[PDB]
């Protein structure tokens, strides 16, 4: 294309905590990151004779 499109991807986040006798465990979290964008130009030269 004239300009490209950013890549996307999801990621989970969690940390292992100490779990003493019969407690509630704290959940994790999901998040997304996106890539950058690139584009392409045009060039040209010529001659007349």
């Amino acid at each position: 294309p004239q300009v490209m499109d950013a890549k996307w991807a999801l990621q989970g986040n969690c940390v292992f905590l100490e779990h003493i006798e019969g407690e509630e465990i704290k959940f994790g979290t999901i998040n997304a990151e996106n890539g950058p964008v690139a584009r392409i130009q045009t060039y040209a030269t010529g001659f007349e004779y």
Binding site: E21, G22, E23, E24, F27, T29, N31, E33, N34, P36
Partner: protein, 125 residues
């Protein structure tokens, strides 16, 4: 990702429910102690201390709002089925008097011959 090839941008998706919250970690103060399967009021939370703790240790309190068999009541009082239950932190015993005690439950089964009680636990208000 340090040293990543590309300057990517990370967007967080918010999430409020950190946990189910049926139990709460709590830290023992100086004048507090616990042993397993005994009711306690620690740092404003009332529940069943599932673990032993003596001094600055971490213990967890069951606050499931389930039905609990306790005993450890003021034996002189009568506990009919349906009566509210209050925790007297000074005496560390359950009681129906509501002078300055925390409301913690309602009796499901009346005081038997051995002072045993079944009661629903309340939401820690």
């Amino acid at each position: 990702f340090k040293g990543q090839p590309t300057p990517s941008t990370i967007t967080q998706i918010t999430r409020a429910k950190i946990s189910d919250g049926k139990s709460v970690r709590v830290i023992l103060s100086e004048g507090e102690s616990t042993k397993t399967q005994q009711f306690y009021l620690i740092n404003g939370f009332f529940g069943v201390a599932m673990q032993d703790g003596e001094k600055g240790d971490e213990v967890t309190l069951q606050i499931e709002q389930a039905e609990y068999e306790t005993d450890n009541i003021v034996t002189s009082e009568a506990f009919e089925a349906g009566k509210l239950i209050y925790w007297d932190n000074t005496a560390k015993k359950f009681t129906t008097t509501s002078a300055s005690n925390r409301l913690v439950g309602r009796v499901t089964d009346g005081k038997d011959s051995n002072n045993v009680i079944w009661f629903i636990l309340l939401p820690q208000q």
